[PDB]
């Protein structure tokens, strides 16, 4: 028990590693896909108005509206087409690291160091955005929050815990435990049944929402994982950490499939997002750039250099028209 | 421009004016981040200033101080310290009374002050250090000074030398010319503890003004 259980766990881990190695290689695997070479994305819009560091942004369903959270205590809902401030939501807490847009477009979510996921109702009467459902129950800070639907939300926190909440009652209905370190990122599957979760314990765990248990784990990194994102297929995901590398894992094979690293890159990755087709993988770094890797060729296809501080958040439209990055220079820009 | 689009532009301009006014009002505030240990290093200075994060707002001498209790965040400090890169100062407290108390109180992570002094964001952020429980130090020091705290003392007894020794030891970890460390002695009985941080904040803002005037 004191040592027999530990020996059994070590033997099980060794057997899992051996099975993973035996379930690898097979029919390096690149087929001369004729990569995109160099893509020259340019800044089409600039969005001024924030007076502190932009920590998170999220796109809307219509790919025309977006929400941005800054350290000055404000959410701003921008109309990206005409550079219009649709809404300016003040917040009780000025320390927010995440913000979300409900897919229905009726709500936004906001969270940070106050350990509360606040929902805000946009499409309501009285012409003002009001607070509704300050969900509470986490002990650590919230690093991410994603809407399942108008009634269900998922929140990843710094107390080594993810949570699934229903917003109608205000009570958490599922708790996801198993991470040893603080959880930093969260990406929902397209079918809204599963989600990946990266932690500072250099582990990413794939969870089933309905069952409530970790279906599998991946431990191929060496530092704190900061960002994660699903492939549009829902069968793979990619992530980045503070060891200046990105890794694409696959859900079914349960291995690390590809690694994006460079010798001259010695800065951590803050934000990771795919394009619509999944061929492009855009990652924001601490070197003030935003690199665009080829997700199937593992080379730096492009560089987005328009920010004078740390690129913190990075989002891509649902229709693939635009890429919006927010950095610590109080400005977020749109590339096309 | 349609009538609806012109009214939308007018609404956006009103929002921009409100944002500028709020930023103008908030640029006068002073952001101080409060750090230390649970042994009377946080609550006494919070009380003498008058869930996840606690705000302590006050206005001293037409200066809006707001103090940032993050003591409830029982987690790793590395993943949320970048939120405090823009603060004026770090009010860090070190317990004298725990020179012999095991927890040792002086050896928090062995680097409770080293990590704060050099966490790649506080490279020019001043630290106001507070020496905790001076009265109990004066009524307690007659019990094994040269102990597990610092076995290199070779010095005099009583409060006025041991306190100076520990203060110099904690200042010796600075290794920063631009950054300054302001130390003070507290007893949780006095009322002159807002001016210790206020004069410090005046010094940092005068230094920032000198740097902005192109003279240093």
């Amino acid at each position, epitope marked *: 028990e004191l040592d027999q259980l530990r020996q059994e766990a070590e033997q099980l881990k060794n057997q899992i590693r051996d099975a993973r190695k035996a379930c690898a290689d097979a029919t390096q695997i690149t087929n001369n896909i004729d990569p995109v070479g160099r893509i020259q994305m340019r800044t089409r819009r600039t969005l001024r108005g924030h007076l502190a560091k932009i920590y998170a942004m999220h796109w809307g369903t219509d790919s025309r509206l977006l929400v941005s959270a800054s350290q000055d205590g404000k959410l701003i809902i921008w109309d990206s087409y005409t550079t219009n401030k649709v809404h300016a939501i003040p917040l009780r807490s000025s320390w927010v690291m995440t913000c979300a847009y409900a897919p229905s477009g009726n709500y936004v979510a906001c969270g940070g160091l106050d350990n509360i996921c606040s929902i805000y109702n946009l499409k309501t*009467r009285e012409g003002n955005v009001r607070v509704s459902r300050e969900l509470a129950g986490h002990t650590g800070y919230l690093s991410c929050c994603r809407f399942l639907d108008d009634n269900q939300i998922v929140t990843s926190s710094g107390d080594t815990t993810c949570a699934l909440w229903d917003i109608e009652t205000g009570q958490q209905t599922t708790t996801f435990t198993g991470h040893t370190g603080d959880v930093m990122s969260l990406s929902l599957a397209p079918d809204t049944r599963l989600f990946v979760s990266g932690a500072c314990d250099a582990s990413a765990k794939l969870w089933d929402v309905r069952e409530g248990m970790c279906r599998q784990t991946f431990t191929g990194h060496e530092s704190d994982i900061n960002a994660i994102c699903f492939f549009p297929n829902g069968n793979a995901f990619a992530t980045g950490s503070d060891d200046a590398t990105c890794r694409l894992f696959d859900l079914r094979a349960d291995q690390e499939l590809m690694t994006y690293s460079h010798d001259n890159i010695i800065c951590g990755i803050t934000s990771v997002s795919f394009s619509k087709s999944g061929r492009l993988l855009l990652a924001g770094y601490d070197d003030f750039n935003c690199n665009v890797w080829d997700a199937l060729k593992a080379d730096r296809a492009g560089v987005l250099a328009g920010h004078d501080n740390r690129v913190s958040c990075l989002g891509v439209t649902d229709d693939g028209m635009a890429v919006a990055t927010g950095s610590w220079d109080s400005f977020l820009k749109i590339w096309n | 421009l349609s009538a609806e689009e012109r009214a939308a532009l007018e*609404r956006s301009k009103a929002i921009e004016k409100n944002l500028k006014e709020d930023g103008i009002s908030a640029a006068k505030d002073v952001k101080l981040l409060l750090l230390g240990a649970g042994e009377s290093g946080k609550n006494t200075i919070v009380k003498q200033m008058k869930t996840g994060i606690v705000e302590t707002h006050f206005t001293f001498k037409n200066l809006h101080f707001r103090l940032f209790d993050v003591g409830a965040q029982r987690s790793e400090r590395k993943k949320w310290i970048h939120c405090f890169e823009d603060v004026t100062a770090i009010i860090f407290c070190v317990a004298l009374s725990g020179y012999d108390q095991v927890l040792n109180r002086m050896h928090a992570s062995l680097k409770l002050f080293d990590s704060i002094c050099n966490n790649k964001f506080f490279i020019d952020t001043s630290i106001i250090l507070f020496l905790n429980k001076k009265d109990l130090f004066g009524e307690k020091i007659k019990k094994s000074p040269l102990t597990i705290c610092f076995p290199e003392y070779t010095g005099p007894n009583t409060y006025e030398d041991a306190a100076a020794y520990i203060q110099a030891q904690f200042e010796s970890k600075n290794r920063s010319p631009n950054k300054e460390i302001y130390c003070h002695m507290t007893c949780s009985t006095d009322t002159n503890n807002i001016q210790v941080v206020f004069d410090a904040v005046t010094d940092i803002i005068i230094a920032n003004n000198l740097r902005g005037c192109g003279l240093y």
Partner: single-chain antibody
Amino acid sequence: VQLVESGGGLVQPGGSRKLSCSASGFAFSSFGMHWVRQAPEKGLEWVAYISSGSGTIYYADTVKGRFTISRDDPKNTLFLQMTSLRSEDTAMYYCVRSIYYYGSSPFDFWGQGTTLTVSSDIVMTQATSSVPVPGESVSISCRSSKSLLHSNGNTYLYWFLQRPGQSPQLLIYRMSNLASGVPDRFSGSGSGTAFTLTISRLEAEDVGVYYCMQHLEYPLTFGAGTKLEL
């Protein structure tokens, strides 16, 4: 939401009357306000428009220069002062809530109006005056003198309904986009200078007069009014 009208009554010609509107239940300071008149036996007609912040003010050409519109946001009260009252000023007046951003619903709420009795525009006309018509589907047409499709893909025709003894209500904003508290049986369609309103499975409490209003460019010109009766 409650917009309450006050003032009116019987006046002598050449006098002045100060109509007032008290707004409650909503953020009055972020809403544009409209004054819209209606003749005792004819269709609706727009009078005045004030925007949020008291910045942009538009008046009707038929009453421009003698009518003043104003507001007080601390008191939450809209005001319309009218001097040199004429015989055509005998009408009953409406205060209209409107809000303008992406996806907004202007002209959504209409107040309970007040009566006053004195002892490069665009033509907006409906070719049908009355249709006798439950359980069926009706289709009602509206025509304009200019194309209402602007270059951003937005058409600016709004469909309103006026019940016998009720303030007007918004059914559709911006060419087949429904509003809050409206059954899904109503629908819209059409193109430039030719719009259709479709009611499928017409239940009761749809008797009344329908109007089509344009918001492409000021002044605001209403239609004639398609009357549906059992």
